[PDB]
Design a protein around this ligand. Structure first.
Ligand SMILES: C=CCCn1cc(-c2cccc(C(=O)N(C)C)c2)c2cc[nH]c2c1=O
Length: 135
């Protein structure tokens, strides 16, 4: 019964205790304010930041590590575009990504089981809803 809450607990703690704790990671903590970076949204069409990922986790957006990791990757790809691949901002984004992968590997077996159990439950609840409607 608590599989989504347990899955989201793991990912949120990766974000707050690992990824946010990367030194000098503040540029990625919150969405960019165009009063501080005026051309940002002229260049980045698909913005992402760690606060937005935490809100997504709190609403149980992610049911797999792949979908979480798509947003984490978007932070790195956006830094490569906006700042260049050799900018210090990109080097800090790349550390955020690597600490996320290394921390996730600490929970590999447990997250593999949670993703299967969350899928099994969603499939069962879908079939129930379909049968209740036809009847
Ligand atoms: C979430 C990803 C954006 C990462 N990021 C951030 C900034 C930056 C600098 C100063 C203030 C702020 C800001 O708006 N706040 C709310 C702290 C943001 C920046 C400046 C040049 N390149 C970048 C860059 O890529």
């Amino acid at each position: 019964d608590d599989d989504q809450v347990a899955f989201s607990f793991i990912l949120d703690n990766i974000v707050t205790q690992k990824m946010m704790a990367v030194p000098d990671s503040w540029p990625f903590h919150h969405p960019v304010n165009k009063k501080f970076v005026p051309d940002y949204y002229k260049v980045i069409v698909n913005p992402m930041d760690l606060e937005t990922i935490r809100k997504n986790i709190s609403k149980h957006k992610y049911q797999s590590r792949e979908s979480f990791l798509d947003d984490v990757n978007l932070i790195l790809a956006n830094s490569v575009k906006y700042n260049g691949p050799e900018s210090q901002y990109t080097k800090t984004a790349q550390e955020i990504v690597n600490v996320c992968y290394q921390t996730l590997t600490e929970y590999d077996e447990h997250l593999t089981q949670l993703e299967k159990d969350i899928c099994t439950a969603k499939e069962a609840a879908l079939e129930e809803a379909e049968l209740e409607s036809l009847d």
